[PDB]
Design a protein around this ligand. Structure first.
Ligand SMILES: *[C@@H]1O[C@H](CO)[C@@H](O[C@@H]2O[C@H](CO)[C@@H](O[C@@H]3O[C@H](CO)[C@@H](O)[C@H](O)[C@@H]3O)[C@H](O)[C@H]2NC(C)=O)[C@H](O)[C@H]1NC(C)=O
Lengths: 222, 213
């Protein structure tokens, strides 16, 4: 039996609030404390606070004073964490995790996490810029080229090359969320340097949320 | 109160991993350790300094003394590659260490191939400049990319992305993108990404001068 299950992904504007749900089993609800812990992309774990669902007692980390609200609903054995006054730096995966409560047994069961994306952005299609092969992207007999898919929202975007005919040596990177609240990613491919004068290279970009479809030819820098 | 972990630990299979975690009030309180693999939730491997939860292999052990907590992994195997976090309580609040990336070298090191891309003229028209540094097909995953503009370190205006491990040769690739305003971009000449990697004896620098053709 699953002991913890969280609500789905959230997108919120700066200044708004987000309420994450964590439904627990009866056993977990009655005998454990629940910790709330968040983690931003490529960063570490950050503890936010705790709640004892049976009693309703709570504690928060000083950094989140006033901004976090932990509540419960006994009838459906669910606990909640609401984070208010959201800012870009609050974009992260938010976890609930149970612990028996020196007298701490650790967080031995974790929810799947809830992604919260904080951005002021409305739906927006990407600009697609060439990453042109040049002497500065040539390592011996291999040349690198690509497409910069910049300033779109929300996820996701897909990229292919030459309408799917070119797959070898292609690396399409996971997107990053910029400080602007828009996503950006790159798709690159390594090819024989000798092919640059004779072979055509086109990246095919589809950002379905904005219905943006772009084919960008990538030519050597002259 | 903060807990200090080594950012990275690299060893060979079968060797014994030692991951430390220091803090003023450690001998006051119990330490727990968590394992986290990419795309997954943390897993508790040690609690109360030395205790293994049920189902955790016996090669994981812990100790805490002299304000230093240590996670030890005997006969380190491939499945042990992960990020490891220590954690304690100071009175009420929980504190996490910064995390230790544990790399188990399963194949020879491969230095990255480094490529640099100036901003396109098309983008410059839009009033922004993106400079992309590509590290291609390297092993192990740990790599550092830093931006220098006219030999001045750049902080706060770059972002990194890494691919998943290649199924076949088990290598990685990484992109670093420096974003400036068009104005700031045009105020400088030398753009460089400095790359360090265990497969490199010394740092490698790929650079260009704004206007090279
Ligand atoms: C704890 O959770 C339970 C169940 O989610 C809450 O009970 C539910 O409360 C809502 C609103 O108070 C009820 O919805 C109402 O339904 C009627 C008919 O469908 C509709 O006309 C109303 O406009 C309203 O939407 C819902 O029926 C009710 N469900 C049950 C099983 O009682 C409860 O309020 C929660 N407790 C706390 C303290 O939050």
């Amino acid at each position: 039996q699953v002991q913890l299950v969280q609500s789905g992904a959230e997108v919120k504007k700066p200044g708004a609030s987000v309420k994450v749900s964590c439904k627990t089993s009866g056993y977990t609800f009655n005998n454990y404390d629940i910790n709330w812990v968040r983690q931003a992309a490529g960063q570490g774990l950050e503890w936010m606070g705790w709640m004892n669902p049976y009693s309703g007692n709570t504690g928060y980390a000083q950094k989140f004073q006033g901004r976090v609200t932990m509540t419960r609903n006994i009838s459906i054995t669910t606990v909640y964490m609401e984070l208010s006054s959201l800012r870009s730096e609050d974009t992260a995966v938010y976890y609930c995790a149970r612990e028996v409560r020196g007298y701490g047994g650790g967080s031995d069961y974790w929810g799947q996490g809830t992604l919260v994306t904080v951005s002021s952005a409305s739906t927006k299609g990407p600009s697609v810029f060439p990453l042109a092969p040049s002497s500065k992207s040539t390592s011996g007999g291999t040349a690198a080229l690509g497409c910069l898919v910049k300033d779109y929202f929300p996820e996701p975007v897909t990229v292919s090359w030459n309408s799917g005919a070119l797959t070898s040596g292609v690396h399409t990177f996971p997107a990053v969320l910029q400080s602007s609240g828009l996503y950006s990613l790159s798709s690159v491919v390594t090819v024989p340097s000798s092919s640059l004068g004779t072979q055509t290279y086109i990246c095919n970009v589809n950002h379905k949320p904005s219905n943006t479809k772009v084919d960008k030819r990538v030519e050597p820098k002259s | 109160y903060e807990l200090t972990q080594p950012p990275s630990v690299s060893l060979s299979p079968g060797q014994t991993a030692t991951i430390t975690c220091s803090g003023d009030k450690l001998d006051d309180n119990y330490v727990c350790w968590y394992q986290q693999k990419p795309g997954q939730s943390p897993v508790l491997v040690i609690y109360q300094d030395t205790m293994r939860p049920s189902g955790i292999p016996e090669r994981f052990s812990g100790s805490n003394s002299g304000n230093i907590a240590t996670l030890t992994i005997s006969g380190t195997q491939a499945v042990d590659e992960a990020d490891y976090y220590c954690q304690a309580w100071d009175g009420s609040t929980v504190v996490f260490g910064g995390g230790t990336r544990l790399t188990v070298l399963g194949q020879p090191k491969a230095a990255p191939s480094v490529f640099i891309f100036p901003p396109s003229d098309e983008q410059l028209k839009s009033g922004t400049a993106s400079v992309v540094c590509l590290l291609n097909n390297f092993y192990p995953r740990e790599a550092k990319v830093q931006w220098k503009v006219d030999n001045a370190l750049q902080s706060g205006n770059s972002q990194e992305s890494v691919t998943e491990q290649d199924s076949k040769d088990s290598t990685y690739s990484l992109s670093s993108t420096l974003t400036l305003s068009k104005a700031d971009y045009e105020k400088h000449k030398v753009y460089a990404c400095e790359v360090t990697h265990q497969g490199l004896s010394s740092p490698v620098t790929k650079s260009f001068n704004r206007g090279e053709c």
